């Protein structure tokens, strides 16, 4: 009988302090009546955004940052880091047919007591003076490279905290460590961190979110 | 349901002269040990005298409803013979234990105990009792169980 857009309500989300352009997107919460239920609806919001659109780089740089929304303050919605992803067409452009896929994985705790899981990928390149129209690495090299990447990721994420992981994660720090230490086994290319997956969170914290806002 | 229409037909008529498929007529007048023999022959020779006359492929049969109808429940006869003649190549003990026959006949047997008030024990059949083993035992408590559907008579 009545249109919902009569009673529909408009809010505004804001990204955490680790990134540049905190003003990204707004929200349509259809009721302002139950603000306990409205706050609970805002606690379960998760926005996935571009890296480029959040960091102002014009090149649509193929990444995706998942941000879970937690807190409410005067139409302005406080957010928390939730994950990392690529876009699909990037990965389908990456995976090619005469090189060798190498994926590594690690289960993770971070110093903010976050249970996490990290997926790294790395391909194999061919050298300057090739004649073979393909570059396959022996499987011993693949085990060695998976071991090296697993240990590098493990120490690199057990050292840092969550926002420190994000701050390492923006300027491509970790893949250059892989580029350095993994060069001595087999020459690789397209080394990236494909996905980042939160698994478990600590007891519900608020002040860390306000630190991550300012 | 072709023959079965003029078996349960109320006020049973005098005779029945009709022509059907010759293979279906072989399903009618089959003896209990054939691949031709199935549920239908036991039903008809339970409730209707049948004779093949003048094969026309097709064939004509004459049916006579036994007007003092034999008091055998055709519903339970239907269900029992249907289950045992769907799986004619399967052993009789394994066929009751499918998954859903262990549910459908379970609900039918507890509906059969609605006017009996028999205490369904916690032992009920996965180890030793009413769902798994008692149905195996009732088969061994009658003329069935290791005999097959094309070897037991009515």
């Amino acid at each position: 009988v009545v249109d919902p857009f009569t009673r529909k309500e408009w809010f505004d989300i804001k990204a955490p302090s680790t990134f540049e352009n905190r003003n990204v997107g707004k929200t349509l919460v259809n009721k302002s009546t139950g603000l306990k239920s409205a706050s609970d609806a805002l606690k379960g919001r998760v926005v996935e955004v571009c890296l480029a659109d959040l960091q102002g780089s014009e090149d649509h740089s193929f990444r995706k940052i998942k941000l879970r929304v937690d807190e409410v303050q005067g139409k302005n919605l406080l957010t928390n880091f939730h994950g990392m992803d690529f876009t699909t067409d990037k990965l389908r452009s990456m995976v090619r047919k005469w090189q060798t896929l190498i994926e590594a994985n690690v289960t993770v705790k971070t110093s903010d007591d976050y249970v996490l899981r990290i997926f790294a990928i790395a391909f194999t390149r061919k050298q300057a003076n090739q004649v073979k129209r393909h570059s396959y690495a022996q499987s011993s090299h693949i085990r060695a490279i998976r071991k090296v990447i697993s240990e590098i990721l493990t120490k690199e994420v057990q050292g840092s905290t969550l926002a420190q992981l994000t701050s390492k994660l923006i300027p491509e720090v970790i893949n250059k460590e892989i580029e350095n230490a993994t060069k001595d086994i087999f020459p690789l290319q397209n080394i990236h961190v494909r996905k980042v997956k939160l698994l478990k969170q600590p007891k519900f914290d608020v002040g860390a979110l306000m630190a991550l806002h300012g | 349901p072709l023959v079965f229409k003029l078996i349960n037909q109320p006020r049973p008529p005098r005779v029945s002269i009709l022509m059907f498929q010759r293979e279906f007529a072989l399903r009618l007048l089959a003896r209990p040990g054939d691949s031709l023999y199935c549920r239908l022959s036991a039903n008809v020779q339970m409730w209707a005298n049948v004779t093949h006359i003048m094969k026309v492929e097709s064939s004509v049969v004459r049916l006579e409803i036994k007007n003092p109808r034999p008091q055998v429940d055709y519903n339970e006869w239907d269900g029992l013979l249907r289950i045992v003649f769907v799986r004619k190549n399967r052993t009789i003990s394994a066929g009751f234990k499918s998954t859903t026959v262990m549910d459908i006949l379970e609900k039918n047997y507890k509906t059969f105990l609605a006017m009996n008030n028999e205490m369904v024990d916690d032992t009920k059949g996965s180890m030793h009792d009413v769902v798994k083993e008692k149905i195996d035992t009732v088969l061994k408590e009658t003329d069935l169980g290791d005999k097959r559907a094309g070897k037991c008579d009515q």
Partner: protein
Amino acid sequence: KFESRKIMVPPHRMTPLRNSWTKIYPPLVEHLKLQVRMNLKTKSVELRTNPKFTTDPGALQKGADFIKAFTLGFDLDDSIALLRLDDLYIETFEVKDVKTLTGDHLSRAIGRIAGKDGKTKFAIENATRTRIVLADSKIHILGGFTHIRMARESVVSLILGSPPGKVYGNLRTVASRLKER
């Protein structure tokens, strides 16, 4: 009032791209009035429209369809007809979407769709008024919606093992019942 889309280029298609680029970009720049750039490093075609150009937002979409269909392996002139005609679309399917095939079954299926000297395939394109790219496991159909549906019927006929003669029969049947109306 600019609007910018980017599309990736595979190196399989990049050599016909860098060969026929001199015919690709001026009809988008002049005949369709679109701003066209190329990052050959990232292999990215960048179609942006400006307030200078004619405000035709559908022309940007048809130019994206142009670059996409050429990226999918289709010819120049067919994609120019896509710039002209609107009712032409693209189907894209896999072999394993219809029937699971393995090894030389896949190769023989592709050969039966193509035929010797393409004579099975080309006779499709004349009689379906469509164009087809047979990729590795991908099929790509370009034409009218009824026409790409009929081409889908033909290729699903070919993929399930039916002989090409029955395909010629159904093909001339559909062509006779379509050209008459």
